[PDB]
Design a binder for this molecule. Structure first.
Ligand SMILES: Nc1nc2c(ncn2[C@@H]2O[C@@H]3COP(=O)(O)O[C@H]3[C@H]2O)c(=O)[nH]1
Length: 124
């Protein structure tokens, strides 16, 4: 799996700009997690410690009745806001089909991903 993860991370513009040794560590520590259609991946208001990169499928993002914000797909990512400052989730993320996410915990994110301009300067 490590090699599959590497080839994938090297294909995503946000992450292909990272040194390959950092990508190798990410591939080492990430957890592959799977969801079915309609499954809540993140709930607004919860406290979070994980970052997600979509490696298969699509998700819907909604936010306080909730309003639809956008859909994200393979190579997109989400969950950074709870890792920036306060740890609260700011929106819901819901699987829109069979989804696989590569999940990175806070310990790894703060060292390997948090300084990336694409992520740190991400605006919606
Ligand atoms: N607050 C907000 N989050 C969004 C939006 N579009 C995608 N997201 C993602 O939805 C995620 C919910 O978890 P986080 O708040 O940690 O991080 C959020 C973002 O990564 C948006 O328009 N507003």
């Amino acid at each position: 799996k490590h090699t599959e993860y590497m080839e994938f991370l090297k294909s995503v513009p946000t992450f292909q700009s990272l040194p390959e040794e950092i990508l190798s560590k990410l591939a080492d520590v990430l957890e592959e997690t799977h969801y079915e259609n309609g499954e809540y991946i993140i709930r607004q208001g919860a406290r979070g410690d994980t970052f997600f990169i979509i490696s298969k499928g699509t998700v819907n993002v909604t936010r306080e009745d909730p309003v639809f914000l956008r859909t994200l797909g393979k190579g997109d990512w989400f969950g950074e806001k709870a890792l920036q400052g306060e740890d609260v989730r700011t929106a819901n993320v819901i699987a829109a089909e069979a989804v696989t996410c590569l999940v990175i915990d806070r310990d790894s994110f703060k060292h390997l991903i948090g300084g990336l301009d694409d992520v740190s300067n991400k605006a919606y």
